[PDB]
Amino acid sequence: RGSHRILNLVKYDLYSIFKSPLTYLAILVVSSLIATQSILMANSMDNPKHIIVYGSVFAAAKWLLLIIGLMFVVKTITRDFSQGTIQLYMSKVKTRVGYIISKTISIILISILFALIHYVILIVVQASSNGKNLAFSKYVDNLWFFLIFLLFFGLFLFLITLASQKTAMIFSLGVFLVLIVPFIKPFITFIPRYGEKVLDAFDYIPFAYLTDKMISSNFDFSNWQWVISLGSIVIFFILNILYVAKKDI
């Protein structure tokens, strides 16, 4: 049935993920970068008894793994449009909707697996070094944050790829959206006579506060942020279904 068709699609994209050399090249680069950063940041800037504080490693590993998982998501969601085999899938309404449900299940699964990768790498780092481990509830909430971040950005870039049907532009917009806002914000926000007001209102635009709290080593949320984020993800899902069922190639 349709349920087997969707689950079969999620299993097969993840299978295609697991059978590439870049997935392990990416794991080796992230592990090497995080280990050098953690050693430089804690084992020599004050010469302790080799104690390491895990907030910096948490933030750096989370940041690097998010920008790598994000690029993995843009490539996975833009593969079919790049080769144009997406034309073979957009045939009937039932397949077009099962396609949207299946991509959502695939995004959920990629986010969960990358969160597990974060968990294993950080656990190994904690095992090697010396200190006090972090609680599991932080990691579960962190898992939820990975899910929210990846779902929002993957659906936004999916809408963009539907409008353009070009793959280089999406890759540029993905890099642009992740790295421009943290880069532009310190050099311009402190300047105006409206900066404090815009900064508080910056906590409601989903792109802005998700990327701002992306480089933080702990996240905290209000009720309004949770409702706005969930409503935005749901609206993007509904909008994606309507546009995929109303667009013509």
Partner: protein
Amino acid sequence: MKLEHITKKYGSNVVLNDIDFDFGDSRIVGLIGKNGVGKTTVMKVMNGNIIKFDGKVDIDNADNIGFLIEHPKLYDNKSGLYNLKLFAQVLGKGFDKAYTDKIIDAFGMRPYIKKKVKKYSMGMKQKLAIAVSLMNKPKFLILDEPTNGMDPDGSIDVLTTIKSLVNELDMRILISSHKLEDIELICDRAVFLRDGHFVQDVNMEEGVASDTTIVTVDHKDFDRTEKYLAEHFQLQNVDKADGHLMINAQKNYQVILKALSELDIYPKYIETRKSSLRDTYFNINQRGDK
């Protein structure tokens, strides 16, 4: 799956103008037209890719649709078997080893089914595209130039295999392609596209009255030959000044020459003038380009 009074427009340019189609007792249909007239648009409308049809299309949900839209769509960095398994699991009901093995064996892809598609040739990709499309186990197959990179002998081989599968599994094909000499070898009917509409529709088994066969005979035998032809089939034009008699188009000349050779009669000459797809297409379409 029928289309009745279908019109599709892009801004102010009219691509399709009140077209009807129905698969009535026919298995292979051919679609012939020029470049950019909206052939890919009509196939996409018949397929399901385009959504704003502005008419009514009746398709049963249990029926699967397989298609090829002109260039092959495959996974370039991955192998052919990966593509075959994925589109069988994703588009079709499932995967069966015997059925897939028969498909692989009939097409002839045993040496290179495990090679990368990036290393394939154009004809190899075209055959892989037809096979991946067929993996859906469709009830209607829609191919856009399936033979756009292969040799004529290859064309005969692919179409003969396609016809064989038409017989091994009750399946109906809609084909849009150029090279009408290749379409006419195995096809049941053809539809002609001009000015955004299908101007003429020809069913080849029944034929048309414009197709002609001209037989010339001796003066002493002229009366007797005219008597026999008047007895047996319909006579349209007879020309005593010319000495030429016009009969209906016949694919096999065997029985006619058997009857005349058994009655000791040898015509001086025979040839045929026919309204084939080259003649009708060129007469209709020479009107707007030259």
